[PDB]
Design a protein around this ligand. Structure first.
Ligand SMILES: Nc1ncnc2c1ncn2[C@@H]1O[C@H](COP(=O)(O)OP(=O)(O)OP(=O)(O)O)[C@@H](O)[C@H]1O
Ligand SMILES: Nc1ncnc2c1ncn2[C@@H]1O[C@H](COP(=O)(O)OP(=O)(O)O)[C@@H](O)[C@H]1O
Ligand SMILES: [Mg+2]
Ligand SMILES: [Mg+2]
Lengths: 237, 239, 371, 224, 373
């Protein structure tokens, strides 16, 4: 791979572009975040890491609009830029039309932007992967977005390091998914995080952030204490 | 225009460019400065000049105001440009507030200039090291120094140039309020430091001194001759 | 106690051998006749037309011997041989009929040693080295007293430094100090330069490097003086252009020789470099090279000393004062001082006056100054 | 990886990594938060003698309710702190209030994110502020990752100081315990003895505003 | 006192030796037989019954057999007092006698001097427990290199492939060569160090040969541990660009890889790959089918620094008491090689103080000096 691997503007003699592959690698290096959904609820259960015992866990669930929340995995800087951008878009959409911005439209716009600096020799991708839980007129939406802009509308998705265990659990329990209460929804997300985490490590009411959106409930963030009832009621092994 | 990045961080975490710039400053002439109770002195090597070479066009020392004086070490054009920038800045500060620019403020401005020119996305960092001496409007024999990297500090004396190392150890040694009590013995310490590099008694040591809020003054060569003569008298008495 | 052991047994040797052997010599016979018998029997063992080349040795009494016609023939050796001199590639002696290994003789080697070892004791000694006492003492610590007094290190525990770099501007008596070390030390110093190991083709450079290192180890426990290497390698670059890739291979071979997997004898490496910041960060690794020494430009007093030592074999004039030359506070290496002295002498010779003059030395100063 | 902003194959921009290396090379500073306030103690790098302690400035004031400590490039800290002060005063002008420490830290980090500027800043910052949620400490790194910490250590002795902080710190102390432990660690990690001139010490309390300790109280705590 | 007694007694010994030489008289001049007697008449007779030439047998055609022999004179011969017909082999070194040319003695295969002395049968003087700061790496290496050899039935019961191929990489100087030496010393198998420079020769044809003979030698031996060093020198990026003339090294690397794992089993050969810049290494070689258990050596931590310090302090004349953990603390980001050089500097400081004790003060001075330079 000598040469052909600097800036997105260079096409490899393989139909491949490798800066994007590196951005996706950074996405994996990011921390675990799982989004899933029911007929009327979308739950993002995310593992906030602990850099140091004296440093509080890095929050990774951001409420962008009343009906839209994001879980981030990757460069916190690019995540912050993108979160600012979606907040601006939601405000502009609400201004122009007194409406909640459609989740699909929002995700398409974000994908478009993150594509834009992939065809010019002056800029870089955004090594940040987002799981978006939104509630539009059509109901709950779970979207995954990567630096490549290849947004995916998923019944349940997982991103970040160790995301494969969450993927396994979600694939196994999809049949139940779309047919469970809100508490069961959160419990399934918690089970996914438990599978992802090392067996010795357990989800305390300090490592988990739960962003829930749905009917008659703007995207609400549960951290520290708000996570306590869910973890307390959750099953063990 | 150019819009091309420069000043790339190194694998070690340093800037090859800034280290090159500081060594390029080091290779130049040597100059010392000291502060007294009301006298701030600044001597410097003349660096040789042909009998046909006017000294007026060798201005390695510049009075940026009635309280700030910079001795240069590097490239003369860079000196000229940075000096003119700083002096336009000081007149602008005079516009802003009807008070003379403090050495601290001017040093801040110079450091900001250095940072801009080292991280302005395509530039040649000024290979210069500057030494300023002033008296605040209230009056304070303040002396400041600025590295080409932009880092500046408060200094009671300094010595920059090719001999900077040895002169720095020398001045760190055998320096005290006894030496810096007043104009007396202070020029003597300066000349002793510059003769640390020997044999140039009459060929170098162009000297200036500024009294508290009085003015800056270049020391005339008959006075320099008298000072060096009495200094060598003191020497021979010592030995 | 150890002294007691050695003294006791040594006296035992003197007594045993001297007394018994002298008794037999007093009864000298029964020795000369046997010696002559044996010598003539060896001669009887065929000594016609005979030569052999040793390709290899199987074991005691059996080895393969090849002739110019490729007569590879395997033969059982004759014990009469000297034995243990049978290094592969040695010139053996073979009976005309049975090709019996009976003798070996080379008495001739590649003159690489005679080429790379010239004037082992140059005219320059530490007396000729005017100044640099600190550097001189440090290099002696590094090089000589390990060899001249292999007792202190042995008794205390550590082995001496292996590689010593001497870094400084272009001309500060690096080769002079190398020469003085050679002359003062009894070991077979080796001069080497950085402009010859850059061979035309692949493998040539590393091959001659390895051969040079092996020569150094074999012929004498001595010093190897590697001059400028910055023209070689300069660290390990991205390794794109073939020439620089090969030169990097040459440095890596140098690095293996400096400290490799197997071992290293009592051969010390002395590097001389104009610039050091650009050298391979790995090559100078403290395990391999230690005691990097500044060799800076002489100060005023060192310049006085250098002029004096250069001119010791120079009948300066009464009017000639060697202070106008110390006056110049600029770049004046020991080589520069030598050039100044030589130019003053030559100009005096040209202007026909047997005695040099202050003006002649002045003009030598201006015409030796480059910048 | 080579290039200006090229993404390294193993992730990261590799200029963030270079900046981290520069921060590690930088001098050492410590910050501790307590319900009674936040204390900052930064070792200085006074060069050869003749240096007044008011020559190197490793502590700065953000409003009368936050202090900031630096590790890295002096002028980089100067520029970042200038931005932070300007943003804080702009927010105060627009709000009739003072930012939260989280908000000022994230604003400065947001500026740091832009790599105009061709290189990341070579300074890591520690803001000890007093806001609606009491005294808090926010550590910001050149990458822009800002997090509030109970006790942080940065610079050349970053790792060792952080380990000592982990050993000594508990959820319950006061500003006095914070300062005494910080000074103990600073002396233990100092380049040379604790001369009372090679350090800068500040505190911001739910009460007295941000304050630089004067020579008297410096020597007092030192002997303590 | 003692020194003068030495000088006297060694003078006595030198006198005794020269006296022996002059009195009796033993020398060689040109060729010699110093060892008395050496009569070899029967040796001559059996040499005549022998003193055979040798060549390379080609084929045994028929099932009385027809051996074919090639040298400066071709031949077709067979039969001998020798048995094990052609030792069930054709391309050997036959070793056949003259005089009807039917009597033989098998011989090993000819191999060029390069590989002959690269065999490096010497045992480096290093052993385990002298390694600090890379406990995990040495654990990995011990496992991979020993479990397949030491009580390996446990290693086969699990039905797991035996790893084969390890590449040591890290900063310049971390004890990689030291660990390689230790493994070489401890191991009991055909060990073969390799130097990269010796594989670069005058134009094409040399490296590929020597590599192939090396490999067949290893295959002939029961079980081999090969120890390539200078892999950075031998084998690089396959790209040509301007290397169209330098393709020789790439060719040799290609043959190396093919012998490592091509269209044939490579055999019970375990490869060690020494390097310090593990990025320019060619992808084909770095393929984990040939370098299974790449190991990374990092700078030692405090405990590793202390352990290396005491290891080097194994030497005598050292202080009665030293406080090694503080020594390590004072030297952070220091290689084990730098610990070794610090011990050396402490010894040199003791000498330059004319002190036969290496004090903690000496260690501190050495640390200060090395840090400052
Ligand atoms: N773990 C260790 N234990 C003991 N000594 C060590 C250790 N690591 C390094 N050393 C010391 O460092 C030197 C080892 O150098 P060696 O040649 O083995 O290193 P390397 O990792 O192969 O790299 P390089 O060839 O770049 O030096 C010796 O001084 C050895 O004493
Ligand atoms: N003590 C000394 N230090 C440096 N140079 C000296 C000294 N004594 C004599 N010389 C002169 O220095 C010259 C040799 O310098 P050299 O070793 O060639 O420097 P380099 O190797 O850096 O070119 C000689 O001509 C010699 O006359
Ligand atoms: Mg020389
Ligand atoms: Mg090694």
């Amino acid at each position: 791979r000598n040469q052909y691997d600097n800036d997105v503007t260079v096409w490899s003699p393989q139909g491949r572009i490798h800066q994007i592959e590196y951005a996706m690698e950074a996405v994996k290096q990011g921390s675990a975040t799982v989004g899933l959904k029911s007929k009327t609820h979308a739950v993002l259960v995310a593992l906030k890491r602990a850099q140091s015992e004296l440093a509080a866990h890095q929050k990774k669930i951001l409420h962008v609009d009343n009906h839209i929340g994001i879980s981030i995995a990757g460069l916190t800087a690019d995540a912050r830029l993108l979160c600012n951008f979606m907040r601006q878009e939601c405000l502009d959409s609400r201004f122009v039309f007194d409406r909640p911005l459609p989740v699909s439209r929002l995700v398409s716009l974000i994908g478009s932007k993150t594509q834009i600096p992939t065809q010019r020799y002056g800029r870089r991708p955004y090594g940040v992967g987002l799981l978006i839980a939104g509630y539009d007129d059509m109901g709950p939406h779970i979207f995954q977005t990567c630096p490549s802009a290849n947004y995916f509308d998923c019944r349940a998705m997982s991103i970040g390091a160790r995301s494969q265990s969450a993927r396994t659990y979600l694939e196994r329990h999809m049949s139940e998914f779309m047919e469970c209460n809100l508490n069961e929804l959160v419990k399934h997300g918690l089970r996914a995080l438990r599978e992802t985490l090392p067996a010795e490590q357990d989800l305390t009411t300090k490592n988990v952030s739960i962003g829930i959106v749905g009917k008659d409930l703007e995207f609400t963030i549960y951290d520290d204490d708000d996570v306590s009832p869910f973890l307390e009621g959750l099953e063990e092994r | 225009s150019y819009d091309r990045a420069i000043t790339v961080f190194s694998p070690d975490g340093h800037l090859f460019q800034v280290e090159y710039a500081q060594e390029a400053v080091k290779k130049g002439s040597t100059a010392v400065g000291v502060r007294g109770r009301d006298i701030v002195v600044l001597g410097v090597e003349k660096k040789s000049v042909a009998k046909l070479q006017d000294e007026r066009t060798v201005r390695k020392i510049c009075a940026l105001d009635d309280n700030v004086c910079m001795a240069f070490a590097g490239l003369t054009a860079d000196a000229r440009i940075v000096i003119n920038r700083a002096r336009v800045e000081c007149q602008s500060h005079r516009l802003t507030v009807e008070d003379p620019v403090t050495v601290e403020y001017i040093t801040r401005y110079i450091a900001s200039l250095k940072q801009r020119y080292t991280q302005s996305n395509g530039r040649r960092p000024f290979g210069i090291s500057a030494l300023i001496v002033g008296f605040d409007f209230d009056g304070t024999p303040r002396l400041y120094q600025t590295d080409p990297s932009g880092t500046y500090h408060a200094w009671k004396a300094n010595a920059i140039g090719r001999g900077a190392k040895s002169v720095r150890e020398f001045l760190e040694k055998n320096y005290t309020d006894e030496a810096i009590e007043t104009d007396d013995l202070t020029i003597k310490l300066v000349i002793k430091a510059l003769l640390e590099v020997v044999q140039s008694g009459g060929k170098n040591i162009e000297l200036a001194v500024m009294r508290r809020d009085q003015s800056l003054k270049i020391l005339n060569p008959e006075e320099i001759e008298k000072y060096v003569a009495e200094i060598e008298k003191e020497k021979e008495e010592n030995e | 106690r150890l002294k007691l052991l050695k003294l006791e047994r040594i006296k035992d040797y003197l007594l045993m051998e001297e007394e018994f052997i002298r008794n037999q010599e007093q009864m000298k016979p029964l020795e000369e006749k046997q010696e002559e018998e044996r010598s003539k029997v060896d001669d009887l063992r065929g000594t016609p037309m005979s030569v052999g080349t040793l390709e290899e040795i199987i074991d005691d009494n059996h080895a393969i011997v090849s002739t110019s016609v490729g007569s590879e023939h395997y033969v059982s050796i004759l014990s009469f041989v000297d034995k243990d001199l049978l290094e592969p590639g040695c010139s053996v002696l073979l009976n005309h009929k049975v090709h019996a290994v009976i003798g070996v003789l080379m008495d001739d080697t590649d003159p690489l040693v005679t080429v790379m070892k010239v004037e082992k004791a140059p005219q320059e000694t530490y007396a000729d080295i005017g100044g640099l006492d600190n550097q001189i003492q440090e290099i002696k610590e590094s090089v000589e007293l390990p060899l001249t007094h292999p007792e202190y290190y042995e008794e205390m525990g550590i082995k001496p430094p292996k590689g010593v770099i001497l870094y400084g501007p272009p001309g500060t008596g690096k080769t002079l100090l190398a020469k003085a070390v050679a002359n003062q030390t009894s070991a077979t110093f080796l001069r080497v330069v950085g402009s010859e190991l850059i061979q035309k083709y692949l493998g040539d450079g590393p091959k001659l490097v390895r051969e040079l290192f092996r020569v150094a180890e074999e012929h004498a426990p001595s010093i190897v003086f590697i001059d400028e290497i910055d023209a070689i390698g300069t660290k390990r670059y991205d390794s794109n252009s073939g020439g620089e890739r090969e030169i990097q291979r040459t440095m890596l071979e140098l690095l293996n020789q400096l400290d490799g997997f197997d071992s290293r004898g009592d051969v010390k490496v002395i590097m001389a470099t104009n610039r050091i910041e650009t050298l391979d960060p790995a090559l100078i690794r403290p395990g391999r090279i230690d005691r990097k020494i500044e060799f800076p430009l002489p100060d005023e007093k060192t310049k006085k000393r250098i002029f004096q030592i250069h001119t010791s074999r120079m009948t300066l004039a009464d009017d000639v004062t060697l202070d106008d030359l110390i006056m110049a506070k600029d770049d004046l290496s020991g080589a520069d001082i030598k050039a100044i002295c030589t130019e003053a002498g030559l100009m005096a010779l040209r202007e026909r006056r047997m005695k040099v003059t202050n003006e002649d030395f002045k003009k030598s100063k201006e015409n030796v100054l480059y910048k | 990886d080579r290039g200006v902003n090229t993404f390294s194959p193993e992730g990261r921009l590799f200029q963030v990594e270079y900046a981290i290396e520069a921060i590690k090379l930088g001098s050492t500073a410590i910050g501790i938060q307590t319900s009674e306030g936040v204390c900052l103690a930064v070792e200085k790098r006074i060069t050869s003698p003749l240096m007044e302690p008011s020559s190197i400035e490793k502590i700065v004031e953000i409003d009368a309710h936050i202090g900031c400590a630096m590790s890295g490039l002096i002028a980089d800290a100067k520029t970042l702190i200038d931005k932070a002060r300007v943003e804080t005063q702009n927010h105060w002008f627009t709000y009739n209030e003072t930012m939260t420490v989280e908000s000022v830290t994230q604003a400065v980090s947001n500026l740091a994110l832009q790599f105009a500027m061709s290189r990341p800043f070579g300074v890591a910052l520690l803001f000890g502020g007093v806001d609606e949620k009491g005294p808090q400490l926010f550590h910001m790194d050149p990458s822009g990752t800002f997090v509030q910490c109970d006790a942080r250590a940065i610079g050349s002795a970053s790792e060792g100081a952080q380990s000592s902080l982990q050993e000594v710190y508990h959820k319950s102390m006061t500003l006095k315990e914070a300062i005494k432990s910080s000074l103990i660690i600073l002396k233990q990690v100092m380049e040379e003895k604790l001369n009372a001139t090679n350090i800068e010490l500040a505190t911001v309390q739910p009460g007295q505003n941000f304050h630089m300790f004067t020579k008297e109280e410096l020597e007092e705590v030192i002997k303590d | 006192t003692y020194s003068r007694q030495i000088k006297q007694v060694e003078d006595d010994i030198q006198q005794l030796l020269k006296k022996i030489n002059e009195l009796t008289g033993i020398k060689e001049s040109d060729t010699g037989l110093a060892p008395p007697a050496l009569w070899d008449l029967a040796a001559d007779k059996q040499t005549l019954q022998s003193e055979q030439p040798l060549q390379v047998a080609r084929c045994t055609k028929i099932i009385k057999y027809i051996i074919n022999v090639k040298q400066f004179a071709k031949f077709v011969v067979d039969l001998s007092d020798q048995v094990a017909p052609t030792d069930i082999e054709e391309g050997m070194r036959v070793g056949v006698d003259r005089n009807k040319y039917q009597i033989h003695i098998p011989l090993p295969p000819k191999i060029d001097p390069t590989v002959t002395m690269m065999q490096v049968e010497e045992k480096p003087d290093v052993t385990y427990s002298d390694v600090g700061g890379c406990k995990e790496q040495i654990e990995k290496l011990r496992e991979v290199v020993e479990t397949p050899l030491l009580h390996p039935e446990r290693f086969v019961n699990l039905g797991i492939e035996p790893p084969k191929g390890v590449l040591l990489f890290g900063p310049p100087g971390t004890g990689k060569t030291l660990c390689a030496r230790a493994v070489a010393n401890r191991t009991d198998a055909c060990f073969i160090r390799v130097i990269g420079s010796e594989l670069v020769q005058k134009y094409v044809g040399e490296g590929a040969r020597m590599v192939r003979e090396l490999f067949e030698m290893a295959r002939t031996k029961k079980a081999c541990l090969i120890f390539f060093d200078e892999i950075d020198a031998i084998g690089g990026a396959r790209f040509d660009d301007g290397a169209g003339g330098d393709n020789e090294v790439q060719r040799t690397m290609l043959e190396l890889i093919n012998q490592l794992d091509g269209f044939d089993p490579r055999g019970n050969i375990k490869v060690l790959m020494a390097t310090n810049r593990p990025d320019t290494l060619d992808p084909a070689l770095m393929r984990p089918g040939r370098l299974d258990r790449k190991i990374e050596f990092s700078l030692p931590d405090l405990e590793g620094r202390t352990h290396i310090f005491k290891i080097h302090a194994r030497s005598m004349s050292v202080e009665r008491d030293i406080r090694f953990e503080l020594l390590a603390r004072l030297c952070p980001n220091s290689t084990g090689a730098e610990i070794r050089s610090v011990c050396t500097e402490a010894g040199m400081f003791a000498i330059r103080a004319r002190r036969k004790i290496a004090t903690e003060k000496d260690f501190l001075e050495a640390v200060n000096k090395v840090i400052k330079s």
